[PDB]
C-alpha cells in the first residue's frame, strides 16, 4: 500500500499556508515573502501568482465553489482573489494583529479567521464579508481554526494558551474547553473526518501530538518522536494514517489505529510549517510547505 512518490517539489521562500483545489490538479502556497502561488502539480506550471503584500501570508484556502482563493497576512488583512481573472474581490482589515489560520465552511458562505488578537472571527461572503461574530475567550494567539466536517455548525480553535475550544456558530461561549496538557500551547487542531470516531488531534511546541475523544474529553493517545515544534498533525481523509510535520524538518506518517510511527521523511527543505491533503484522496496526494519550498507527494 504505502508507496510514496515525489509528484512535484519546487523551491520558494518559506511556505506558511498550503491547500489543494478539489477538482483541478492545483496547489496554492502562501509565502512568508507576501507572495502566493497556484501551481498545476501535474504539468508543473503556475496557474497564477500574486505579490499580495510585503508581509507574511500565513493562511490561504481555495473557495472552489466561488472560483476564489482567500488569504490572510501579517498586515492584518484578508484578501480574496478570483483565480480565473486575477480580480481582487475584497480586501479588508480582519484583525489588529497577525492572522494565523483561515477555515472555509463546507456548504455555507462562512469563513473563520484565527488571530494573535486572541479571537476567532466569522465573516459571511453573502453579506458583503460582514463580521457576523467574534468568539472571545482564548488568552494567547489563536493558531488554528477548523470546522467539524461532520457537524460544521461547530468548530475548534487551537491556541497558545494550551487549550482547544469548541464553539457553536451563533453562541458566544465554548461548548467546552479542552485542557491539553501541551504546556507550550497548541499550534494546530484537526478533526478525524469519518463517523466512527469522535476524534480530534492537536500538535504542540512541546514536541507532542495528542488524540482526543471530543465527547468524553479524554486523551486517547500521545504521539512522540518529533525533535522540534510540531507545526501540524492531521488525519488523512481515506487512509488509516496521521500525518505530522515539524521544525525538525521531517514529515511523519503514523498508523491511525496503533499510533506507532510508520515512516519518517527527511524532505530536505528545512522546517515544515503546513499541510494539505487532497480532499477526495485523489492519487493519495498530500502536500506540505517548508522554509525552502513545497512538496506534493502521492502516497499510493
Amino acid at each position: 500500500k504505502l508507496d510514496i512518490k515525489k509528484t512535484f517539489s519546487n523551491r520558494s521562500d518559506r511556505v506558511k499556508g498550503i491547500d489543494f483545489h478539489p477538482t483541478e490538479p492545483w496547489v496554492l502556497t502562501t509565502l512568508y515573502s507576501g507572495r502566493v502561488e497556484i501551481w498545476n502539480y501535474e504539468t508543473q506550471v503556475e496557474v497564477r501568482s500574486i505579490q499580495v503584500t510585503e508581509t507574511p501570508v500565513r493562511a490561504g484556502k481555495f473557495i472552489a465553489r466561488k472560483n476564489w482563493i482567500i488569504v490572510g497576512s501579517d498586515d492584518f488583512r484578508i484578501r480574496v482573489f478570483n483565480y480565473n481573472t486575477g480580480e481582487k474581490v475584497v480586501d479588508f482589515e480582519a484583525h489588529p494583529d497577525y492572522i494565523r489560520s483561515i477555515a472555509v465552511h463546507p456548504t455555507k458562505p462562512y469563513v473563520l479567521s484565527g488571530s494573535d488578537d486572541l479571537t476567532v472571527k466569522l465573516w459571511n461572503w453573502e453579506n458583503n464579508w460582514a463580521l457576523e461574530q467574534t468568539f472571545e475567550g482564548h488568552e494567547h494567539f489563536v493558531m488554528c481554526v477548523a470546522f467539524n466536517p461532520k457537524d460544521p455548525s461547530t468548530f475548534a480553535s487551537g491556541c497558545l494558551d494550551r487549550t482547544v475550544k469548541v464553539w457553536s456558530l451563533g453562541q458566544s461561549t465554548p461548548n467546552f474547553t479542552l485542557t491539553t496538557g501541551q504546556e507550550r500551547g497548541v499550534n494546530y487542531v484537526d478533526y478525524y473526518p469519518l463517523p466512527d470516531k469522535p476524534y480530534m488531534i492537536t500538535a504542540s511546541d512541546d514536541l507532542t501530538i495528542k488524540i482526543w475523544d471530543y465527547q468524553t474529553k479524554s486523551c486517547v493517545a500521545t504521539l512522540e518522536g518529533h525533535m522540534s515544534n510540531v507545526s501540524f498533525a492531521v488525519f488523512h481523509p481515506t487512509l488509516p494514517i496521521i500525518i505530522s510535520g515539524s521544525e525538525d524538518g521531517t514529515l511523519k506518517i503514523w498508523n491511525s489505529s496503533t499510533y506507532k510511527v510508520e515512516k519518517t521523511l527527511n524532505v530536505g527543505l528545512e522546517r515544515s510549517w503546513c499541510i494539505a491533503t487532497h480532499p477526495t484522496g485523489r492519487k493519495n496526494y498530500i502536500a506540505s510547505g517548508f522554509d525552502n519550498g513545497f512538496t506534493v507527494l502521492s502516497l499510493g
Binding site: 518559506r14 512568508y32 497577525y98 494567539f141 493558531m143 497558545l160 522546517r271
Partner: peptide
C-alpha cells in the same frame, strides 16, 4: 512587539 512565533 511580536512576543513569539514570528517565523
Amino acid at each position: 512587539i511580536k512576543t513569539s512565533h514570528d517565523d
